[PDB]
Amino acid sequence: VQLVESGGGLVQAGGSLRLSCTASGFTFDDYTMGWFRQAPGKEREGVSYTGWSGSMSGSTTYYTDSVKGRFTISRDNAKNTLYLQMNSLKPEDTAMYYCAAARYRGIGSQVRWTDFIYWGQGTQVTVSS
Amino acid sequence: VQLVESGGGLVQAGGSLRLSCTASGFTFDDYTMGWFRQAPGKEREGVSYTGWSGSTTYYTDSVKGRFTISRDNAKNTLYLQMNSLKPEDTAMYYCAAARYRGIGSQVRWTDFIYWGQGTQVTVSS
Amino acid sequence: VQLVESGGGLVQAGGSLRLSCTASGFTFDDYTMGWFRQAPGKEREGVSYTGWSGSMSGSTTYYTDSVKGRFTISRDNAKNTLYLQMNSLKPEDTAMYYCAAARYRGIGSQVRWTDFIYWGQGTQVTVSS
Amino acid sequence: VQLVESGGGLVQAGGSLRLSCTASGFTFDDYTMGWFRQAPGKEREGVSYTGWSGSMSGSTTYYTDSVKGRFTISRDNAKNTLYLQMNSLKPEDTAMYYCAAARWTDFIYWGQGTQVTVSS
Structure with a gap:
């Protein structure tokens, strides 16, 4: 089970970025996938x-x-x-962005944050002044 | 007459950026606006x-x-909007303006008279 | 000829980081080594x-x-x-930091920025508010 | 009585960070100051x-x-x-770091903390 993030980098305020997260073997289409960030x-x-x-x-x-x-x-x-797809980027959006997966295959709007079990290494997104 | 570019930065190959260029006093909607780059x-x-x-x-x-x-x-x-960025796209990107006439003439590259200071776009390996 | 940077990351204002740059085959002790950054x-x-x-x-x-x-x-x-060693980090120090190498000596002439020929891929340093 | 931490963030393994903790009224040179962390x-x-x-x-x-x-x-x-000053950071050092004051149970005044994350 691997999660590899891509698409991060450095940009001015108001610019745009697009993150991607390819997934190794866990049957992707049945899992609830999510994005996290850490300031x-x-x-x-x-x-x-x-x-x-x-x-x-x-x-x-x-x-x-x-x-x-x-x-x-x-x-x-x-x-x-x-x-x-991150458009109109603000300097408060500056973090390391993680790509996570929750595993019990049927959670809709009762998705606790603690349900995300598989994680990726992350990618840096920096929005400067 | 001012042209201020924004939205540049650094990204890896395959990533995406979006440049913006706000314009000061001249009729923006009657001018042909363009993007240049310099390797x-x-x-x-x-x-x-x-x-x-x-x-x-x-x-x-x-x-x-x-x-x-x-x-x-x-x-x-x-x-x-720059999608699927290649390392050959690495340049400083300028926002230029030309004035249209004719009425059957063409905009050539030398018609662009007003220029901006530019913004740097870097696509690394 | 490889130059691999490390030690970057994200930190608050006033914090500290320490970058490292290991060098592959080129006789390190006879070259002028430098650090660059790109906002x-x-x-x-x-x-x-x-x-x-x-x-x-x-x-x-x-x-x-x-x-x-x-x-x-x-x-x-x-x-x-x-x-x-980057101490007392300011938000204006936020850039991608590169590790470069130069080999021109020129007895009588000082080091210029264009003399740096070998470069690394870089590492991100982000100093937030 | 306030204790404000700073200098935390995210870094790779082997990197370095430096935390700071300014102190409000008034103790400081007569108190035993310490650092805690919570995984x-x-x-x-x-x-x-x-x-x-x-x-x-x-x-x-x-x-x-x-x-x-x-x-x-x-x-x-x-x-x-x-x-x-945290040098040669390991992934086991990943915690929220608190700045406490005494004069382990003697530490009475605490700060809000700062996050230190050491990834692989």
């Missing part, structure tokens, strides 16, 4: 997840208030890849 | 322009299918 | 170098005004490693 | 302290076995600041 000196917080419920027949996507209307999560079940 | 040690080449009956947008072969130019005449801002 | 959207500037002087009887170390009294360069000719 | 899911453990001994003939600094030879505590009584 320097602060705890790791949740950014966005998307994933699937059986009790509603369908998918549930989430976005935090600080990334609302600016970030976009998407998945490609054929290539087992998760994406995070 | 280290090489001459300044043209990337993409858009502007003026109908509108005409241009893209160079090296940025074909990967770059996207757009303008916002309300906010007087020019955009350049 | 987001700006050109690549020079930070500090150490090595040859101009006289074949001395070492010469350099430090830019923006890093004066806060940064410290050092080399280990036995392990072929270059170090950069 | 995710584990209890809060002690890292290092420095301060007075019994009797007043001298100072005593302490370092835990897991940080021995890699960490360095220091204080500045003029600026009322405590420092922790």
